[model samples]
Target: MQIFVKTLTGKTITLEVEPSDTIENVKAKIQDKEGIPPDQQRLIFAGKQLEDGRTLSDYNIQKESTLHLVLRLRG
Candidate 1:
């Protein structure tokens, strides 16, 4: 998935994902991958917020997907 960045190569990242994996699982993966603790996160990518319990395929997150990560309580 790609991340929004201001410069450099940008914050684009690649995650090994399958159609069967839900957003939550992906979030969990990113949780540790980015050294982020397992806390609630707000997903805002591809110009939309990902809903819970939804499959990546459901959101058409096949390839060239994008994602956003944010702490639950942090601004």
Candidate 2:
């Protein structure tokens, strides 16, 4: 399955993943691409936190699903 993730920086990235993949996997991928650590990342989709060990299916996420990540901001 493929998912669209919108970063806090207003960058939208597309990820091709499987429902069996854990949220941590997604986070790791994003971290690799965005240079952000997992501890500093929080993915929210469908009004829930995408935590470790949670699968996309757990969130009822289907192919072409869209997820958003909000990074901690500082003024």
Candidate 3:
């Protein structure tokens, strides 16, 4: 499935992923493509925060679905 991710900065990126792929896996790809560390990435989809332990299918993510990516702010 192809997912659309929109960053907090308003940048949009498209990623090709599998339903069985974990959220952490997606974060890793995001890190490679956007230079944002996986640990620093907070992903939101369908109005809910995505947990690293969960798979794309667990969240019912479909092709062309859009997810929002937020960067963690350091204290």
Candidate 4:
């Protein structure tokens, strides 16, 4: 399935992934493309925080679903 990821800065990117792909996997991709580490990424979908260990299917994510990517800032 394909998903759309929207960054904190309002930048959007399309990702091709499978239902079995973990949120961590998506984070890794984001890290690769956006230069943000997985540890600093917070993915939110449907008003719920996405867990790293959870699969996309666990969140009931479907094609064209929008996953908001919020980056953690250092103090």
Candidate 5:
């Protein structure tokens, strides 16, 4: 499935991940590609922290679905 994600720096990225991927995996992918540390990273669905181990199934997301990710800057 593909998800639309954006970084804190306003950089947008499209991820094509497996349906079985967990929220934690998504977190790691974002960190790896966007260079955002875990502490400074935030993932939202419509606007919520999807619980750990929560897969797209948990949110009723479909294959190739696009989820927006908004990254907030920390001081």
Candidate 6:
């Protein structure tokens, strides 16, 4: 299914993903499509931070779900 990824600055991207896809996998895709590295990105959904070890199934995500993306702090 397709979903929306929104950055802190309001930049957005439509990404193709599956329920089995892990947060790490999604970050890899972001790096592949954009320039953000996995370690530099943070995925947020439903007031919770999506961790690398978790899959979308853990969140019961559906089509057009929006995930807020924030960059990890350099410090």
**Model 4 segments beyond 4 Å from truth?**
none
Judged by lDDT, which candidate is best? 3
Tens-place lDDT digits, model 6, residues 1-75 = 998999867789889999999999999889988889899898999889998998998988788999998887856
What local lDDT score does residue 32 receive in model 4, on the 0 to 100 scale? 82
List, residue by residue over 1-75, the lDDT tens digit for candidate 5: 677776555667777777688877877887788776655666767666676578867886666555566556645
- lDDT of model number 6: 0.90
**Model 2: worst 10 consecutive residues (lDDT sum):** 66-75
Model 4 Cα displacement at 22 (Å)?
0.5
Ranking by lDDT: 3, 6, 4, 2, 5, 1
Query: Candidate 5 — which pairs collide?
Result: none
Q: Estimate each model's TM-score.
A: 0.67, 0.87, 0.93, 0.91, 0.73, 0.91
Q: List the RMSD of every prediction in angstroms.
A: 4.1, 1.4, 1.3, 1.2, 2.3, 1.4
Model 1 — TM-score against the truth?
0.67
Q: After superposition, how far is residue 10 of candidate 2 from its true place, in Å?
A: 1.3
Whole-model lDDT, candidate 4?
0.88
At residue 40, give the lDDT of candidate 5. 61
Lowest-sum lDDT 10-residue window in model 6: 66-75
* After superposition, candidate 6 runs with Cα above 4 Å error: none
Off by over 4 Å in 3: none
Best by TM-score: 3
Summed over model 5, clashes come to 0
